[PDB]
Amino acid sequence: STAERSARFERDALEFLDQMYSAALRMTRNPADAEDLVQETYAKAYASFHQFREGTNLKAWLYRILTNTFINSYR
Numbered sequence: 001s002t003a004e005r006s007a008r009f010e011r012d013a014l015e016f017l018d019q020m021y022s023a024a025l026r027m028t029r030n031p032a033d034a035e036d037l038v039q040e041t042y043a044k045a046y047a048s049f050h051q052f053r054e055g056t057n058l059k060a061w062l063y064r065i066l067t068n069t070f071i072n073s074y075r
Contacts, residue, residue: 005049006049009049009052010046010049012058013042013045013046013058013062014042016058016059016062017038017042019059020038020041020062020066021034021035021038023063023066024037024038024041024066024070027070027074028070028074033074036074037066037069037070037073037074038066040069040073041062041065041066041069044065044068044069045061045062045065048065
């Protein structure tokens with residue numbers, strides 16, 4: 001189903017939340033900014049599931065959304 005895949009993607013993504021917030025602490029040097037940066041990355045990630053294909057390494061796909069947001073928001 002379209003809903004199943006997507007719910008599976010969410011949980012897979014969330015499994016990494018901590019590794020992602022931890023990386024975010026190291027790039028923003030600020031809990032508050034680290035959180036905002038993660039949150040916005042996940043929101044962006046939920047919103048684009050449509051484009052995440054099949055094999056694509058999930059972690060690298062999130063890393064990419066996270067850098068794009070670091071750059072274009074924080075900074």
